[PDB]
A paper describes a structure:
Interestingly, after protease cleavage of the N-terminal tag, we observed a shift in the gel filtration retention volume to a monodisperse, higher molecular weight (MW) species, consistent with oligomerization. Following protease cleavage of the affinity tag, we used cryo-EM to determine a 2.6 Å-resolution reconstruction, which revealed a hexameric architecture — a back-to-back dimer of trimers. The hexameric assembly is reminiscent of AbiK16, but the mechanisms of assembly are distinct. Assembly of the AbiK hexamer relies on an alpha-helical repeat domain (i.e., αRep), while assembly of the DRT9 hexamer relies on a combination of RNA-RNA (SL5:SL5.1 and SL4:SL4), RNA-protein, and protein-protein interactions, resulting in a buried surface area of 3,000 Å2 between trimers. Although the structures of the trimer and hexamer are nearly equivalent, the hexamer contains additional density near the active site that is not present in the trimer reconstruction. This unmodelled density may correspond to a small stretch of poly-dA product, but repeated efforts to sort these particles failed to separate distinct conformational states. Notably, the U4 motif (123–126) is positioned ~8 Å from the YADD active site, consistent with a role in templating poly-dA synthesis. Overall, these data reveal that the DRT9 RT-ncRNA complex forms a D3 symmetric hexamer that performs RNA-templated poly-dA synthesis. Incubation of the oligomeric RT-ncRNA complex with [α-32P]-dATP, followed by denaturing urea-PAGE analysis, revealed robust and highly processive poly-dA synthesis activity that completely consumed dATP in the reaction, and that required no additional reaction components beyond the RT and ncRNA. Biochemical and structural data demonstrate that a hexameric RT-ncRNA complex polymerizes dATP using a protein primer and poly-uridine template.
DRT9 systems encode a reverse transcriptase (RT) gene and an upstream ncRNA, occasionally in association with a SLATT domain-containing protein. Here we show that DRT9 systems are triggered by phage infection to produce long, uninterrupted chains of polydeoxyadenylate (poly-dA). Poly-dA synthesis is primed by tyrosine residues within the RT itself, and is templated by a structured ncRNA containing a universally conserved poly-uridine tract. Our study reveals a mechanism of antiviral immunity mediated by DRT9 defense systems, in which a ncRNA templates the synthesis of long, kilobase-length homopolymers of deoxyadenylate to drive abortive infection.
Author numbering:
A (entry chain B), B (entry chain D): 1 to 492
C (entry chain C): 251 to 300
The structure:
RNA sequence: AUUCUCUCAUAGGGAUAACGGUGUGGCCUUCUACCUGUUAGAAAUAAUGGGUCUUCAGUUGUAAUUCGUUGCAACUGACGGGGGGGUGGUGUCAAAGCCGUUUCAACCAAGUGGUAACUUACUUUUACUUGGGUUUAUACCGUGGAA
RNA sequence: AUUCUCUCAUAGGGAUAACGGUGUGGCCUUCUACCUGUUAGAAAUAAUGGGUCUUCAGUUGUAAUUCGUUGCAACUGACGGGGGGGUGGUGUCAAAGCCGUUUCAACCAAGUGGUAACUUACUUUUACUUGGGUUUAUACCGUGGAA
């Protein structure tokens, strides 16, 4: 087919995606407003509906208007791409620096330009994916972080002490030399058509150095420049794994890991990229616990939310603290916050050994960790009674974790936090003039919360059971050997 | 879905494929019989239709009977796979030794067993393709011979002299140790379910050593055993490319290529495979023409139908001789063979400057080399007037050839052979009593055959033009940079 | 030995033999890799005199 | 109008008012061990209502082997953090320590110079919600029309 | 029966005779520079019939640059093997050589001790045929039924 049919179909799909997202967004907002009213009573605020503020800067940002007039835009763009006159329109770049983080300025392009960028990125990736290295895991459709994690986990067990080099790059996207970039189009066996070359050069006219962020065409150019670095790194004879601008190298020889520094420095001098000397760790020796070392040594390393070691693979401390933050905020929101207002008009007071708020908080925690599964369904999957199960929780993002002790400590932390939150709720209810210290669940003790909640039934469903990380860990371990990583892992 | 639906669908597709092939086969036979009658006149033999002789050995070989009764076979097999009682039936192995070739005994299995083998091979390949090396090109759906050819062609240009090691293995499939094979299922991070282990072991019960040939389940086991060999070969720091049991290694260091021999020997001792000392070439130094060498040296090497060198990539001599064989036989069949019979009853004698046999031979040659394209369509593709063209000829099997001189010599050989065949046809027609030495095309000379045939028209189509390899080479070169290798290459 | 790489390879040989024979080394009575020099000479890594 | 047209087609002109989604219910079919109530009615079966179990490592004693690890009874071992105060053991020449009872803390806090708040929130690889499909049953959410 | 059923389901029982494909034509739509005949009829356009062109490297002289390589006239260089005999050049002190005319060979054969045959053929990575789709137009090919 001609280029105009492809532009028309890509533009139509892109336009319909934003409309679907907006239609789901305002319905979620209405449902959450209704539940907030039922929770806060008469103290709930009013519902507010917002629209993107950049939809009014230029008419072409609005997906409804783009969809209404897509055939003419297609026609025009096609003609100007066949007349060598096309030029992307200036983007909207409101991104600004954030505390403790890089500015990370990101540009948002209009729908026709982003559609052209994605269309021309897909064909280049399809034509040239077979000439990339097997140790690059970013911006591709056949590799993912979990493959690098599995490769490092498998390789580190074999030996007892290995050397490691960790280095970082400063301003990766904004420091690529244009004369360098243009010289790689005729090397390593790549296939770039003249029209594709034109389209690529059309996106760099405004700048004098670096490549734009926020667009899909720069993700191929990001992997294009490191082909010689990966070629020389593999020729050296050391193992490595690179994701975007973050890399790690390990080897058994000091001389080999010293030569890897010279290779990295030579590539940085060739491409004009300067390394950051404040976020780099350098050369260190990783050994098992208790073994002495002659040089600077460490026991574990962090890589993309994981904590690799000689023995086990665990979750990073920052991600653990964010899980604790979300669970604690859910309990505080559903138990303590409503009772701190000026008046209790429209609220509901627990009575007759019933508490809807505790059930709601438990259900929300179960939806946050499991995703809605029950312990009976999990045990049916484990016993082989059933042969189908879905993974849609937070644990789906860390399927390679095999550290039981950390999960046990998280379970004990959850139980203690729940007990103390219920104690504070009881004290606040006593302060308001209601005494419910002899009713469920305020009467339960810490040592019997799980056992007593494991029995209470409602409508034939055990809706009061406390989720455990160990059970879902066992289910993930069983499903990994029967379906694979790609199937088990989350789609995002 | 359950296992029975998958078995039912796979069996049905396999059964319908043979029926489609047979229905196309007997129609091709009838058409060829009609044309043979019109060509040989009254001396043509009678049409004969055959059936596979092994269809009567066991009813289950017949696809019509299998299709008629597929649901019961599905049911049964499923039940016995869920009761741990399944066992493949003995195959039919009529393959025998051939002169100048290995016996290569091949077993044909029945449809349900081959369907189970393919079904269980597909899921294993999907679950474990990400743990294979990037330099293995056999029995996969993401790598092909042409990728290895492009990698060697690109790498050899950079340097002027490299060392090479070429070695071969004797009886690869029939010498794998079972105790070795069973020990690799728990290493390198593989994922094999217990049911899959059962199915695998079910196909090796009869033998005491080696794996069966002719089935789809052994193609995964072929790539499974060489994981440690490829791991150590990549750890050494040398380049290589392995396809099935054939491998090549090249490097810049004598010590590195000497260590590659020790790695190969250690792997052969570990797996029990013995190398053949009569089909191996050893260690040689490849240099450019005219440069002296201190050790045994050569100028080019052969790999999978190609002839690689420092400068160019050409076609192997054996494939060139087979192309010449096919062209010469086509000309002999359509020009000389009919006139050597006892009587010319029912034949047609050329007259009034007309010759249907010459036109038929030219059309068959064009279909053999191009596939039916015309020089006007090719020049339209080259000039950019059109933007779509198909490649369905013999040249589609060698798209990376860039040796113009060889194609020019083949063109001159074609012209000379055509001229001499027409001269012999004229002499035979003179011997039968007809003098046509002053009529087209017997009057044309060698130096004007192309120029005169390039003008004659019939029904507005230049059906007498002589095909040239250089034009299709230019079209292949242009299409490679605009669609890619996967798209241009043949589907087989 | 006189070479750091050679004394680093000796560790891999010892570890491979321990894995082959099933013997496990004790990490509390071992001293590791150290450089022995004469008294008064500086060292770049952990050093001892006797 | 987010619906439909028109062409000079990253724009401009007409014509019609509806056009996209969410919750609940329905239907379609879809992977499931038992034991018991009350119904119905022939135990073909249904209909509903209650309760239990599922994992791993062992030690066996044995069958099977296809010469192994297997399948098995029976067995026994696992399987929900940490911190600050008080008070008994038992620790020894002192002691560490090791035992368990009783209190305090919504979380970061096993800490800060000091400790409260927050989810349409906050941010560097950092994000997702419950087998599908179809329902002019049923109630509502953008934006229009009417007013 | 290769069609449909039935269950004890790698099998066995019934019932119906049609069931799968190929060539040609049709239709649907699908990527295409011109110049000319004769038609038709208004040059809106058709309908058919004839003929030419398409690639790469240069040298420019110049415009554009977005500071380059570009786009351009015009230019000139490419673009269909080898072998065995005869005979002229020109080779030089001889000579190699280098020039081109004239004959012989269906291919392997630029070779074998010797050279004919073969495609439903022969064989180690070794194989495929012409944008699709739909046509109870039209003629035929397996296997059934009828006979």
């Amino acid at each position: 087919m001609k280029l105009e049919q492809q532009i028309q179909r890509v533009i139509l799909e892109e336009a319909k995606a934003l409309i679907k997202d907006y239609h789901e967004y305002h319905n979620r907002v209405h449902l959450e407003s209704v539940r907030n009213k039922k929770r806060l009573g008469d103290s709930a605020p009013d519902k507010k509906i917002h629209r993107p503020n950049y939809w009014s800067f230029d008419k072409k940002f609005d997906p409804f208007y783009v969809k209404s007039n897509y055939k003419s835009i297609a026609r025009s763009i096609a003609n100007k791409i066949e007349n060598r006159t096309y030029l992307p329109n200036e983007p909207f770049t409101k991104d600004v620096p954030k505390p403790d983080g890089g500015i990370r300025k990101v540009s948002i392009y209009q729908i026709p330009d982003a559609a052209i960028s994605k269309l021309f990125f897909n064909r280049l990736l399809a034509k040239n994916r077979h000439r990339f290295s097997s140790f690059s895991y970013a911006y591709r459709n056949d590799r993912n972080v979990h493959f690098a994690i599995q490769d490092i986990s498998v390789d580190l067990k074999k030996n007892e002490r290995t050397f490691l080099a960790e280095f970082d790059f400063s301003d990766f996207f904004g420091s690529i030399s244009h004369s360098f970039l243009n010289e790689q189009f005729n090397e390593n066996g790549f296939y770039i058509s003249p029209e594709e070359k034109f389209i690529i050069r059309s996106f760099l006219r405004e700048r004098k150095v670096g490549i734009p962020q926020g667009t899909s065409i720069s993700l191929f150019l990001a992997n294009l420049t490191c082909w010689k670095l990966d070629q020389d790194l593999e020729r050296e004879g050391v193992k490595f794994s690179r994701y975007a601008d973050d890399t790690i190298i390990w080897s058994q020889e000091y001389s080999k890991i010293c030569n890897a520094f010279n290779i990295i420095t030579n590539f940085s001098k060739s491409a004009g990229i300067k390394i950051n000397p404040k976020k780099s760790e350098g050369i260190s020796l990783l050994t098992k616990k208790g073994l002495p070392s002659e040089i600077t040594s460490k026991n574990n390393l962090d890589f993309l939310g994981y904590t690799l070691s000689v023995e086990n693979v665990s979750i990073k401390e920052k991600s653990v603290k964010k899980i604790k933050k979300q669970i604690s905020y859910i309990l505080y929101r559903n138990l303590i916050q409503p009772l701190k207002k000026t008046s209790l008009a429209g609220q509901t007071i627990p009575a007759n050994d019933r508490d809807k708020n505790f059930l709601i908080a438990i259900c929300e925690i179960r939806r946050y960790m499991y995703g809605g599964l029950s312990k009976s369904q999990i045990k049916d999957y484990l016993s082989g009674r059933s042969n189908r199960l879905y993974f849609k929780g937070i644990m789906s993002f860390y399927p390679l974790v095999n550290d039981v002790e950390q999960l046990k400590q998280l379970d004990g932390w959850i139980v203690s936090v729940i007990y103390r939150a219920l104690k504070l709720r009881c004290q606040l209810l006593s302060k308001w003039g209601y005494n419910r210290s002899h009713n469920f669940p305020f009467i339960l003790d810490r040592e019997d919360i799980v056992d007593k909640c494991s029995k209470k039934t409602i409508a034939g469903r055990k809706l009061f059971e406390i989720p455990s990380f160990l059970l879902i860990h066992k289910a993930l371990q069983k499903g990994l050997q029967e379906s694979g990583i790609e199937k088990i892992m989350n789609p995002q």
